């Protein structure tokens, strides 16, 4: 084993991570990444094996030294002048506009420094670089539409009931992934909005349309619909006896388990909920961890890969037969560990998103009197364990 | 424009860094052409260079193929070289110029810079001031013996100039075996003037490359 | 009328020429009241603080415009990167030649990107203006490229859009392929040769020595590429005649620094003369400046179309690119720099010299090729297709016939079995009959090469909603001549307005009709007499899951009761009810007319009823946009006005003992 005693006379020993956009959340929301940092150096520290071969994750506040929301010039210049100090080995971005999100790009490509981009809202991805990842950890439909292809497939129904209320959602990655399966079958979809101002005629139209799908596809499906049309249906449901052998109503869209609907719900339905939330502290967790699975699998590789530093000045790049930035963006995409708040998994370090934990709770007809959610499967990822 | 000018300091120290400046400023350096320098001594022959690109692909030969390392300065639209350990038949009459990629010929007049071997002290020994005398005596043709008699400075292969741009009817470069010693007795000669007689005063003044002297006599 | 220019430059020599162009550019405006700023930055290594020392001599003269004024950009990978991010939160345009990369012209994550460089995307543009002539639609997309490719890709994909037509192979690849030679086997196959690399120069020289060691270097290929493409080290394999298109405006600092500055100085005037010249805030560092008038000053800038004596239309592409840049296509032929075309703005028409190729001629080449790749599939059709098993390994002795006369026969390499049974286990069997006679006869008629392969399922396929990303097509061979497995299908499908929907006929050459095979309720009297038209659950006879009879069956309106009777008993082949009916297992077997006729005449115990419904030509099923589609048929009924397809079929499927 090479012994790496060569090239921590700078760092020392320490893998130094930059605290760039220090600036609280104030744009479209009052989140805090102080806090979030606090408590994910106090979360590493507490389960020790995290960092091993002696390493520790150098937290180094780079602050400029609202009006700095979005310049980059601060958070770039004065922050690149006081991490060259000792070494760029590691850097943790937290976007807050297009502004601190652009030079991201710029930074991964005159240092070679694998960066994460925890952005708000979904952003194009028009830079396919591995160097600048992209990680936004936000309600995403892939999962739900995975869940609702694995409920079909282990149950033989090829039809559904697709509820398109708005068009203001990520229905693409639905669409994209329809395209693929052979499994969907649509012949009607359920609109609630569609010019009906007043209210005779949207429950005539309502009236119409569940007798229509009574016979052509009895399984509506949750996939994109408010919560307000959620309630309706739940309402007009118990006052026309929509049973599930009749309507079988599936809640595919699980946001949150405190969000999700637990009155009126009909013995038999198909109501699944995330149990993670969307917490920044419990995100800034998850990158600090998949991190740590980073440079340990670079440390498992070459002893002097993760202890290298990419870069030492703000104008230096790795462009060597051995770099480490290509490894290190590189190794973390095959390793896929299961994160706090979700499964990390990286997609091909781009298009990043984690899969958060599910579980089936069908909500059937309970025998002692009190609606509980019985957990009739499991899915720990694609797989689900019957019982 | 068209600029083939070779700028490179053609006098350094033996077994030194050779920092060769080719100041090419013409359409563009963005990996366009070859740039590199034509090992033409006389006595062997030369091999099958290399070329620079964008990435500045320092490597020329197998043997200096990474020992050297050509410094892509893209301020001033040129690049440096790092030249070391350089033998006697390497060190010869280079042509760091606009190479077509392809290696075609030539459609232009005899340029270049041709660094030598010698010490920068032995070369560097004080311009000697010689007055220029005319002869007007020897009155045999249409070519005689009259000129400057400068010598004592920077090798031969620099920017040989005349009395403020004077008559240059029959000017032609023509590399020669170099002097150890470092006293090159350089000295230009036209063939129709300078051979009449009178007065007429035909003083030249060789410039010099790392220097720009022109007011020795 | 204070708009001041910013410019971006490196060398003293690209700030006297910058001044040049701006006391020059008094004949351009007309001499107007606006002052062009001398800003005169020195170039820096490090990309940020370069950026950083532009932003701050702009921001001590508040200048309104970008422009770079140097092909070397400061960032380490050649992109303009950092007067992007750095103009994109001031909603600046960047109006300065940086790069001739195309993915940083596409505006997806950036808004404030104008670079009036001319990418790929442009040059794929000039590419299809001049391709309207050519009718070279079908291009093979081997770029190896993850952002330029990408670029390319969506490019084309958009020109095929705006065509009204469709490619033949578009994908992307990765850089760094080494068996590249698998690619050009892959497009030597399709009848597309348009060959388009525009990745780097690496991948440019090694397909061009991959192509020079087959000798498929002009021979018909079409070979468009750029200055970029043939730069460094790419030529020093290809012979004299690639199409090297040259970047005009893309690396000159002469008279492009001057263009650019006049263009500039002309975009502004015409942007001060219309309305939207408020003046944004002061954009200092470490404050938010953030122009809220940032997509009404783009949209005014964007429509600033000039009437200039060189370029007769300027105006931006969809992504932000030159104002119609005129790209002077040259070739290498002698290793020169000939024009063979300008881009004017609406075509490219050429001057003096033409299209030149290395391998082909001077003139329109061959872009598309010929039909001589036609893969016969057969079938189970032992009545017609003879399919004998091998003799020997590869030895197929040819067998005698009733006139004495050793019967050419073709061998036929296929999995013998079904899907279960042999999923890819080719077997060659020596496969005789009319079907070989037929096929020699075309080859001797035409020049095409057939090539006689066996399928590997047993069944024809049907219309239904296939378990394949729900595709409403054929599952079977109709299917695979879809996918481009298949030709030619040589067996006699049933005509019909559903299978006339995805592909097409040719001429019919068995002209038979269906009946019922009976055993002679002992008779059948054909299949309207109710005591088989409502058949019970004991009372079913053979039928073949996706077969003519399915299709016939499926297409009824009044046998939809017996349709789903069927299901019961259905086969995956013929054989197996042929099987059964002759060895008293089931009532009846609904087949063709000539098979059954055949099995009748051999068969003595099975004897086939006389009515006979359903007359109709089955016709040879073709592709859809075959070249040769008409040719074929005008072969076969050529073939049957004569005395010669009457003979063999009395010959060969007439056995009567």
């Not at chain 1, 979360?43 to 995290?50: F, W, Y």
């Not at chain 1, 398109?164 to 990520?170: A, K, M, S, Y």
């Not at chain 3, 399915?550 to 013929?574: C, G, P, W």
């Not at chain 3, 089931?586 to 009823?609: M, R």
């Amino acid at each position: 084993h090479p012994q790496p005693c060569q090239i921590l006379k700078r760092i020392g020993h320490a893998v130094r991570v930059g605290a760039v956009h220090l600036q609280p959340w104030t744009t479209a929301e009052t989140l805090w990444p102080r806090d979030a940092l606090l408590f994910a150096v106090e979360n590493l520290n507490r389960v020790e094996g995290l960092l091993p071969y002696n390493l520790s994750l150098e937290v180094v506040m780079a602050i400029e030294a609202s009006p700095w929301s979005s310049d980059p010039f601060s958070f770039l210049q004065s922050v690149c002048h006081t991490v060259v100090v000792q070494g760029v080995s590691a850097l943790l971005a937290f976007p807050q506009s297009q502004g601190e999100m652009m030079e991201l790009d710029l930074v991964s490509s005159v240092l070679h420094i694998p960066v994460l981009s925890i952005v708000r809202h979904e952003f194009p991805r028009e830079s396919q670089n591995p160097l600048h990842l992209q990680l936004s950890l936000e309600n995403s439909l892939s999962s739900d539409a995975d869940v609702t292809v694995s409920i079909l497939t282990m149950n033989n129904w090829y039809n559904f009931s697709l509820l398109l209320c708005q068009e203001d959602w990520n229905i693409t990655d639905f669409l994209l992934l329809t395209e693929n399966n052979s499994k969907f079958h649509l012949e009607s979809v359920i609109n609630i909005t569609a010019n009906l101002s007043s209210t005779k005629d949207l429950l005539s139209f309502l009236q119409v349309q569940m007798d229509n799908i009574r016979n052509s596809t009895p399984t509506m499906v949750m996939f994109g619909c408010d919560m307000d049309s959620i309630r309706q249906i739940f309402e007009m449901s118990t006052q026309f006896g929509l049973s599930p052998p009749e309507l079988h109503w599936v809640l595919g869209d699980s946001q949150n388990v405190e969000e999700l609907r637990t009155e009126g719900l009909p013995l038999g339905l198909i109501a699944h909920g995330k149990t993670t939330q969307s917490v920044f502290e419990y995100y800034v967790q998850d990158a600090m961890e998949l991190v740590a699975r980073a440079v340990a699998t670079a440390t498992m590789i070459q002893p002097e890969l993760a202890l290298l530093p990419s870069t030492m000045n703000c104008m230096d790049v790795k462009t060597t037969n051995l770099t480490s930035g290509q490894y290190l963006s590189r190794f973390l995409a095959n390793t896929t560990f299961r994160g706090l708040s979700g499964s990390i998994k990286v997609k091909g370090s781009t298009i990043i998103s984690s899969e958060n934990n599910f579980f089936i709770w069908n909500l059937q007809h309970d025998p002692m009197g009190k609606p509980m959610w019985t957990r009739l499967g499991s899915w720990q990822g694609g797989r689900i364990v019957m019982d | 424009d068209v600029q083939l000018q070779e700028s490179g300091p053609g006098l350094v120290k033996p077994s030194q860094s050779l920092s060769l400046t080719c100041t090419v400023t013409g359409y563009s350096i963005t990996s366009d052409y070859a740039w590199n320098w034509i090992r033409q001594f006389p006595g062997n022959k030369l091999e099958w260079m290399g070329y620079i690109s964008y990435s500045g692909s320092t490597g020329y030969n197998p043997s200096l193929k990474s020992r050297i390392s050509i410094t892509r300065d893209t301020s001033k639209n040129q690049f440096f070289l790092q030249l070391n350990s350089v033998t006697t038949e390497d060190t010869a009459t280079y042509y760091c110029a606009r190479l077509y990629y392809g290696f075609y010929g030539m459609d232009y007049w005899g340029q270049g810079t041709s660094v030598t071997v010698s010490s920068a002290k032995t070369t560097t020994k004080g311009p000697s001031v010689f007055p220029l005398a005319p002869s007007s005596k020897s009155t045999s043709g249409g070519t005689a013996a009259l000129g400057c008699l400068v010598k004592d400075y920077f090798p031969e292969p620099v920017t040989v100039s005349w009395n403020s741009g004077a008559l240059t009817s029959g000017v032609h470069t023509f590399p020669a075996v170099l002097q150890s010693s470092g006293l090159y007795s350089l000295s230009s000669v036209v063939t129709v003037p300078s051979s009449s007689l009178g007065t007429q005063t035909y003083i030249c003044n060789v410039n010099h490359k790392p220097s720009n002297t022109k007011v020795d006599k | 009328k204070i708009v001041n220019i910013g410019a971006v430059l490196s060398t003293r020599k690209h700030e006297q020429m910058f001044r040049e162009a701006v006391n020059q550019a008094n004949k351009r405006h007309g001499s107007w009241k606006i002052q062009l700023n001398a800003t005169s930055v020195t170039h820096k290594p490090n990309a940020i603080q370069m950026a950083l020392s532009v932003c701050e001599d702009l921001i001590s003269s508040q200048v309104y415009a970008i422009l770079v004024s140097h092909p070397p950009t400061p960032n380490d990978h050649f992109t303009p990167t950092p007067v992007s991010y750095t103009a994109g939160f001031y909603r600046i345009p960047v109006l300065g030649l940086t790069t001739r990369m195309s993915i940083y012209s596409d505006k997806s994550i950036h808004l404030s990107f104008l670079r009036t460089v001319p990418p790929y995307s442009h040059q794929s543009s000039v590419w299809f203006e001049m391709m309207r002539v050519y009718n070279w639609n079908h291009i093979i997309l081997l770029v190896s490229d993850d952002h330029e490719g990408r670029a390319a890709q969506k490019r084309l994909e958009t020109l095929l859009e705006e065509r009204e037509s469709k490619a033949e192979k578009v994908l992307q690849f990765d850089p760094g392929t080494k068996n590249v030679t698998a690619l050009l086997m892959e497009a030597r196959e399709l009848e597309a040769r348009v060959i388009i690399l525009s990745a780097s120069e690496d991948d440019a020289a090694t397909v061009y020595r991959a192509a020079a060691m087959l000798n498929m270097t002009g021979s018909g290929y079409v070979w468009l590429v750029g200055e970029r493409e043939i730069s460094g080290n790419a030529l020093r394999y290809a012979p004299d005649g690639i199409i090297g298109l040259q970047l005009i405006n893309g690396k000159n600092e002469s008279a492009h620094i001057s263009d650019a500055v006049g263009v500039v100085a002309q975009a502004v005037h015409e942007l001060l003369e219309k309305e939207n010249i408020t003046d944004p805030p002061r954009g200092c560092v470490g404050n938010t400046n953030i122009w809220k008038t940032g997509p009404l000053f783009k949209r005014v800038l964007m429509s600033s179309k000039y009437a200039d004596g060189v370029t007769g239309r300027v105006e931006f592409n969809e992504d932000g690119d030159r104002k119609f840049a005129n790209y002077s296509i040259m070739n290498l032929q002698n290793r020169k720099l000939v024009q063979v075309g300008i881009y004017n703005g609406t075509h490219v028409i050429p001057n003096d010299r033409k299209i030149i190729w290395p391998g082909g001629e001077t003139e329109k080449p061959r872009g598309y090729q010929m039909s001589t790749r036609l893969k016969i599939v057969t079938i189970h059709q032992e009545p017609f297709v003879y399919v004998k098993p091998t003799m020997s390994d590869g030895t197929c002795k040819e067998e005698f016939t009733v006139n004495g006369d050793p019967v050419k026969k073709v061998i036929c390499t296929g999995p013998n079995d079904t899907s279960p049974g042999s999923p890819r286990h080719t077997v060659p069997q020596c496969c005789y009959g009319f079907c070989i006679d037929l096929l020699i006869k075309l080859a001797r008629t035409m020049n095409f090469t057939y090539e006689v392969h066996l399928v590997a399922d047993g069944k024809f396929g049907t219309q239904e909603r296939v378990n394949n990303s729900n595709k409403k097509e054929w599952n079977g061979m109709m299917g695979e001549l879809l996918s481009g497995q298949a030709d030619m299908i040589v067996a006699p499908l049933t005509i019909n307005n559903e299978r006339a929907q995805y592909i097409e006929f040719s001429k019919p050459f068995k002209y038979q009709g269906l009946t019922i095979l009976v055993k002679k309720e002992e008779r059948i009297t054909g299949i309207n007499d109710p005591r088989l038209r409502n058949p019970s659950d004991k009372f079913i006879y053979a039928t073949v899951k996706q077969s003519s009879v399915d299709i016939y069956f499926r297409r009824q309106v009044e046998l939809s009761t017996m349709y789903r009777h069927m299901e019961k008993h259905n086969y995956e082949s013929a054989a197996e009810a042929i099987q059964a009916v002759r060895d008293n297992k089931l009532h009846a077997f609904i087949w063709d007319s000539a098979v059954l006729e055949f099995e009748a005449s051999q068969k003595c115990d099975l004897v086939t009823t006389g009515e006979l419904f359903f007359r109709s030509g089955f016709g040879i099923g073709m592709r859809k946009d075959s070249p040769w589609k008409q040719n074929v048929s005008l072969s076969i009924l050529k073939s049957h006005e004569n005395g010669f397809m009457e003979d063999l079929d009395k010959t060969w499927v007439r056995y009567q003992e």
